[model samples]
Target: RPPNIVLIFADDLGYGDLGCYGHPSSTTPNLDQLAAGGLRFTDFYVPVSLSTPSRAALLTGRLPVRMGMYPGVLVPSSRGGLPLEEVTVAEVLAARGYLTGMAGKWHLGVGPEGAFLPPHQGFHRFLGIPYSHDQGPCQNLTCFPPATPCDGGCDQGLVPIPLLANLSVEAQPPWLPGLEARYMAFAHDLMADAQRQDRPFFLYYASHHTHYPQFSGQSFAERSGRGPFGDSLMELDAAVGTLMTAIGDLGLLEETLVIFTADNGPETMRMSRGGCSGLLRCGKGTTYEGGVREPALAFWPGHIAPGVTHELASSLDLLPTLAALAGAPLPNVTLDGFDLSPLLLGTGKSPRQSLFFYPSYPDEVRGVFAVRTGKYKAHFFTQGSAHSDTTADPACHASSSLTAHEPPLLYDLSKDPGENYNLLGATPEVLQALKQLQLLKAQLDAAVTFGPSQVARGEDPALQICCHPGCTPRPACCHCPD
Candidate 1:
């Protein structure tokens, strides 16, 4: 039997949410056990911050921008959907006779109608919201109208979260209509169906909960002393517990690889969401260590060891990693990610040479690119500008390039993960090396941004607005850094 893969992705949970990740207070016995028993990726990060891109990178093993998903976070607009042209893991695995399903949130496209829902993209069975839970025009998740900072409850003035099956409305707010239980049932049925079919599965159980509308598991809402915020997080842990048990009960424990992580870092919402990532920079958004780095626990019953990997890893690499494991050959396209199985299997590929960070917010291309090789990170913040963050916002934007500087800011990441001390006065040799690094970074920016858009959207590159340009990288696991 090929290994079954389950990526249990949590939403909006931050770096300080779980006890395993050094959270002083979190009731996650199961999660702790899972981490101790599986692989704790301490240095793992998400290439893109927002939801759409993060998921895109994880599933496609390429930058979201390359798939035309550049704006980081996208809402339930009736225009954008995952295009059919892009082959998804589901489609790939399905070709090899594996069952694929998803539950909780499916925030992929224009709407959940026809060509836009999960089934369209490779899922055999799917259910969830077409967008984030907090469906108002704003970027917050309240399930209902959100209350002020202290006062809890919805405002009763905005659009509330609606439940959907694939992309169709199943229920609306005021009456979430057995939302949690239904999803739990969804999980159960998925396992049952997989057994019935006896096919290797790729089940993306995206609801590690605690996202918004704040549903705390029954027991947690009563016993947790951590307030609504904390209790709700506890409920999320329970969900993890439930899934783990199901896997074991179904005799799929040693046969499956479970991946747990979050979408972005905590924004100004809840102040603290759930789970934790020890010693990382910031949380949720803003491009800091906390905002970009995520907590990853990977368990493959017999193939991988139960230990933490210090090697730098990103969600963009998951696709290629899993593809190699499953013997799925990637199509002939350049991907912005590298295969990580060599690291997982301890085969020892050269250490990660470089990683680039960009906002990908279609609205602004200012602080767009930052590259890291070892402890040194050179941020190409706007063509030629530069700043250091040994003392600044680990999550603040570091780009704003102008032609005079030939590709913007450059900082030594080792000396400035927080980007405080600019290295403009470094040795001439280092300057040349940094310039060489910038040249490669430009290839990613142009291909995954300008080039793709020009061909796909039928827009003249000359008429392209700076906000929405044409570009993206291809998907080929063999890393060949420009």
Candidate 2:
């Protein structure tokens, strides 16, 4: 039988949040065990750290920027969904006799307007929220968006978007009464259907937890020791355990490939959150390691070994890898990511010799950009959050030879993974190398600019604020946020 593939994704999880990743108090035993049963990646990353573009890259196996998928996600007024030309992993694998199903969050925009659902993307079945729970008010309009303090505490859940069984949500489940349980029910249904069909299956079980609205199970509402958020996180972990048990009960444990990871980095937590980014610097929307560096684990008994791999692999690589596994022809499209089958098989020596990070995936030309070539890395922030009128940012601290001109911050990742060290002026050689990587990145971005723009190629510029924590929109600012 083809291996039953079950992929689980969490929202706003951190690299160090899982117990397997060395969290001091995160009790993600199921995920830790899943890693122990398969492969754990220390350097696996996401192309865009934000939820929407990150998921887009993961599904389509292409850099989100190639599709102009940056800046932010689809609000109520956003234009369209992921470009229709793209082929997701589900599309490829399902064509190869594999029954595909997805249950969790679907952040690729396209809210029931057109062919943007999983079925259109090639999944036989789909279930989950159209976006993160923080997109709209959870309860009603009695209060503000997050429905708390009205002082802006949480990001809020989404509104009534199109969620479906087939292509239509003629009779959909309610969001309030038993929300998480609905996800659990969907998982059970998909798993059982795969077994009944007796075919290899690809299940994208994306869930929201430790994200926003600490409405967890009553059993875990106040029990996780870390409070509402922590308890809810444990509840999510328990759901993983339950899903794993379902596979084991079907006696397909050895033949199933299960994966656990997050869409991006953690959000604001109360005292503590579910996970951490280990050695990364920032959180969700920045170019620093914290935002883009994800916590990834792959489990395929008798296939991938149970160990830690420092070899870098981005989420975008999964599409081609799955295509290769399904024996599907790689489409002749502009997919910037490469199939990472070799890496998963312990043959991929290195991930990307040079990796780039962007603070905003909005356009091909502008936004915060950073490049990493081996040990040397450079971060360039075009504008400021606190002081938009500031001409140039100072190289607060330098270690190697990087500058802070136009807000350029150099980092030596080999010595400082936390991104704390910035080199002011060590040598021209390193600076030249950084410049080379930067030029290479610019060239790549230019090439990607031509590909179909998903977020709108020449959309009218709206008010943008820096991605800094407290940054917000202003009518016209000297510096705009990504």
Candidate 3:
């Protein structure tokens, strides 16, 4: 029988947030242990650096540009979502007889009558919010620190965020304090049911922690020394521990492949409330290392070797890797990922040699903003988005400060992971870096095809999820049935 898979993806978690990744104050014993027991990736990345596009790339093993989800996050009013035509990892596994399930945030498009919900994509069961916790009106100081609206003003007129169970709304603006518990419980039930049926399972656990408007349970709240962000980190760590424990208790640890990674880097715009990207420059919404690079781990007990790897990899590789591991056929479409099963088994190096970084925000000319080949990276365009510390580096400027490099600013990531020094004109290594970029660009140009922009599709007020559609005053008073 094929191995069960548990993929835990975090939202807006930074590269240095984990204890194993050199976080000083946030004590993450569970994640530290997971790293110690698995292969930790130093060069792992996501194709894009935002919530919706990153998730789309992970599940499809394709670039968001090809799927039309790269125009930025889908708001409550946004009409676009992951296209129904694309094949997801869950869809592939479900076709191969694996019981698929999902829990937590689904920032993908919510089409009319919830056409793009998880069940429509491939999962057999789904529970969690339709979008980010911060998409709705600010709840309290915990929603956005100091009781201020996120990204400028609160989404006052937007519908309340809905917690969904398969299709129907379980709660309007889910009980924030109890959200984690609900996710943990869902995981336990899914695993137990799969075990009872004696069939392989695929669980996609997308966590909502460590994002803005952070909130932790009573036991974890006010416990971490770093404030609300740290408190949320601790809670996330505990939830991971619970999942691991559940797998062991069910005697499925050896039969399951557990992978941990984040969708994107931290949102440093929130200052302390965001997160630290460690030595990486900039944060969320940028093509810099801090925004696209991530902390990744693969654990399968006896199968996967325990160590660290500096090989280049991306969330795009997950679909192909998981399909290969399950002895399933690949989707009949263009995939941007490489099969990393060999690397995971410790028998060979990563098959991937280069990765292209795409802009998270909408652009008139959609193309790769940066490309990393082996140890060197070249940025054709540079800009910052929602980052806090402009004093740290000139590259960490405001979002509107865009610059197109003439010769392409180059950096040897192995030597300068912070991307402070540009090797374009100062060194002879520029020749080789430029050559690699040209080769990668030609390869992508020939194979890549941009799809129609789903995110650019104008939003409609009627598309918003409301438990009580006819309730008095609408969204604010939209409540789930008692």
Candidate 4:
């Protein structure tokens, strides 16, 4: 039987947040159990450390740069998103006779245009937010009492968070407080539907938890001694438990592969509580290991042997990996990832050896930030806040935060995962990494060795946008009022 796939993608979850990943503060028992039952990857990575590009790479199994998705996240008012022509995991499986659905954050595009929404992206159904929760106005200092209508919306002077059920706006303000529970419940509903239809299913359950302004339901608020961030994390763990239980209840446990990972590293900025990346250098928006390296776990009962894997894998590989597992055809396009079905099935070694890293936003040299081959990593340029716990807004434009390297910094990750001690004098490894970047650049046919700004900027908000149902040949560069 083809297995079901449940990809639970969390937002802004740090590499060290889970108990299995060495977070001293984690109470994520369900996630730990998943790790105990299957493979816990210590070096799982995202190509870029922002919501939009990370998602584009994960779904397409290609560098977001291949399709020009690496510039930055698409804002609600922006007129761009993942292109419709790109093949998605959902499309691959759907053609293979699997039912596909997605719930939670759909930050790929704000589809008043509809083409970029999940339904058009091969999902049979979708219930999710069109973009990040914080993209709209956030009036309250906290989602607590005294913040009028503190559930999910602020009272006034703020644009409502648009919640979409397929093509329509289900809520102008969108119930935000208990969103974790709602999304999981919605996932269960999808699973039940799949079971009734007796078809393999793919459910992309993206959680809104741990993204600021962090808010878990009242039951979870203040439960974690670490404050709002931790409290929201606890809710995320519980949500995972619910997802696992649903699979078990439907007797789909042995026939299901469950994966849990995040969009990027922990966030910085916002006076509100942010997460820790443990010893990882910096968090989201940077190209350091702390920014792109994420905590990840994969579980498939009976088939996958229980253990940990130091092997390199990535979210980019999941589309190809899962497609191979389901006997679905691979996308007939260039993909930056290798098929990891061997690693997942425990019958062979990983096909992955090298990884490229980029800042959340890039400029110059096509934003080629760093390159990693095996244990060594080299950086030509770097940006964003330093590896610290201080608050810094997770902004899009970061040229001011970027710094160029003279000879470029090198590190042997095998010796220092924290990326602390630069191995510049370790000459042999440094030279090799630099050469690797040249080779990578040559293969991509990208111009120049370096540049001071992004080759591609971002979605142009000037483009025409329309989302009114039954409005034929919707005018471009237009938005229908909510």
lDDT of each: 0.61, 0.64, 0.86, 0.75
lDDT of 1 by residue, 149-231 (tens): 21244333333444556645554432332355667778778777888787777878776365654555346654556666666
User: Which residue pairs collide, candidate 3?
Assistant: 81-109, 143-213
C-alpha RMSD between model 2 and the true structure: 8.4
Clashes in predicted model 3: 2
Residue 390's lDDT in candidate 4: 63
Best by TM-score: 3
Per-residue error (Å), model 4, residue 142: 7.6
Q: What is the TM-score of each candidate against the true structure?
A: 0.79, 0.81, 0.95, 0.87
Candidate 1 Cα lDDT to native: 0.61
Per-prediction count of colliding residue pairs?
Answer: 57, 25, 2, 13
Tens digits of per-residue lDDT for model 3, 142-203: 33223333343345777777899999999876666678899999989998998999889899
Model 4 lDDT, residue 159, Cα: 43
What TM-score would candidate 4 get against the native? 0.87
Cα lDDT tens digits, model 2, 184-264, are 787788778778877787888888776665556555555666655566678788888988888888888878877777877
Worst 10 residues of 4 by lDDT: 448-457
Of the candidates shown, which would achieve the greatest lDDT relative to the real structure? Answer: 3
